[PDB]
Amino acid sequence: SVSKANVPKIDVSPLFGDDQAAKMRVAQQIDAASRDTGFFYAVNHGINVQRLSQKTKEFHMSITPEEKWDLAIRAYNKEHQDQVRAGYYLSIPGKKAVESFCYLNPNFTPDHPRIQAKTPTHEVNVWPDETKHPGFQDFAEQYYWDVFGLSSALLKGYALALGKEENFFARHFKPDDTLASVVLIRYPYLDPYPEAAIKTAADGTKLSFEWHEDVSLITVLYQSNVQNLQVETAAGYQDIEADDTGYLINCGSYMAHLTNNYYKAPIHRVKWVNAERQSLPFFVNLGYDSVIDPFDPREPNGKSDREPLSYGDYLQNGLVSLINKNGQT
Numbered sequence: 123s124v125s126k127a128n129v130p131k132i133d134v135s136p137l138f139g140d141d142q143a144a145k146m147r148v149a150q151q152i153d154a155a156s157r158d159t160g161f162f163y164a165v166n167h168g169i170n171v172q173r174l175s176q177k178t179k180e181f182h183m184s185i186t187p188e189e190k191w192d193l194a195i196r197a198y199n200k201e202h203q204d205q206v207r208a209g210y211y212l213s214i215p216g217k218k219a220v221e222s223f224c225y226l227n228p229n230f231t232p233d234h235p236r237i238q239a240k241t242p243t244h245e246v247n248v249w250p251d252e253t254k255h256p257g258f259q260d261f262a263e264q265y266y267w268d269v270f271g272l273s274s275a276l277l278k279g280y281a282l283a284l285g286k287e288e289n290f291f292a293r294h295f296k297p298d299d300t301l302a303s304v305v306l307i308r309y310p311y312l313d314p315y316p317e318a319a320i321k322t323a324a325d326g327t328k329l330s331f332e333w334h335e336d337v338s339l340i341t342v343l344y345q346s347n348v349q350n351l352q353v354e355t356a357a358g359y360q361d362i363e364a365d366d367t368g369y370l371i372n373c374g375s376y377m378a379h380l381t382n383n384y385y386k387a388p389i390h391r392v393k394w395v396n397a398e399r400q401s402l403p404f405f406v407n408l409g410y411d412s413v414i415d416p417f418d419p420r421e422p423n424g425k426s427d428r429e430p431l432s433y434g435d436y437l438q439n440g441l442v443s444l445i446n447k448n449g450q451t
């Protein structure tokens with residue numbers, strides 16, 4: 123018997139306005155969800171997720187093996203030594219079902235100083251041919267700033283929930299240097315489904331992706347309406363209900379670090395379900411030199427003995443660790 127997680131639906135629209143009391147009431151709900159299971163659904167977010175799902179589908183279903191090779195990250199293409207984060211992540215027929223496309227800050231150009239200095243985790247996005255995928259790059263770049271704006275509002279709610287001024291996190295979340303990423307993940311229907319892409323958990327559950335903590339400040343996830351996520355609690359894993367109109371929100375391990383585990387990074391995993399579906403996370407990352415002094419909301423003085431962690435060092439070590447533990451995606 124698997125129980126269902128209590129994932130509240132929070133109306134985040136006051137975070138875009140100037141009703142300070144209404145923002146505090148949103149902040150309380152974010153606090154409550156972050157201290158409970160760690161997940162909530164953001165509703166009334168203003169983002170056209172229907173156009174998002176349709177444009178992502180057309181891209182996933184029309185891209186050819188030739189274009190996948192030309193866009194592949196260096197894990198699949200030795201010629202692309204500079205693409206570690208951005209590019210296409212190929213499925214392996216008969217072996218690996220999941221495939222995805224990842225892109226970073228569109229402001230990362232050859233003219234960008236972080237690219238000029240060859241700073242790790244900074245890459246220039248690669249895109250498919252415009253004539254083969256008309257308007258895809260325009261949609262994708264626009265979506266990046268749409269979810270950026272939504273994430274900036276959410277960070278105001280998280281700051282207020284912790285008793286800080288509303289720009290506590292958002293001041294480090296800037297369009298010119300953010301390391302945030304969009305990942306357009308396809309989970310295909312396959313008949314027969316390759317058993318090499320199905321992992322069996324310790325409790326017998328069939329998984330597509332094992333347990334993990336998110337490498338992020340927060341994660342802003344859209345998924346199609348197929349139930350798949352489970353969150354770990356002390357009483358075991360609980361199913362997270364699907365909702366293809368809202369964004370699912372949770373903290374990453376950088377939030378757990380700076381709050382002295384007051385807001386934990388929930389451990390979650392992906393159940394195996396043989397169904398064509400989408401998973402579209404936006405990983406809210408700060409700048410390479412972003413540092414937030416850790417604090418403890420439990421203590422009256424808020425003092426913490428945790429070392430400040432440069433976000434760039436956190437992100438580089440976290441992305442490598444996630445590959446070593448859960449595998450190349």
Ligand SMILES: CC(C)[C@@H](NC(=O)[C@H](CS)NC(=O)CCC[C@H](N)C(=O)O)C(=O)O
Nearest residue numbers: 207224303305307331336392401403405451
């Ligand atoms: C759980 C979902 C968010 C999704 N999993 C994921 O997106 C998993 C676990 S959070 N994330 C990753 O592998 C890290 C991708 C980071 C990205 N390439 C970058 O350079 O920033 C899924 O459906 O598998």
Ligand SMILES: [Fe+3]
Nearest residue numbers: 334335336390
């Ligand atoms: Fe995750």
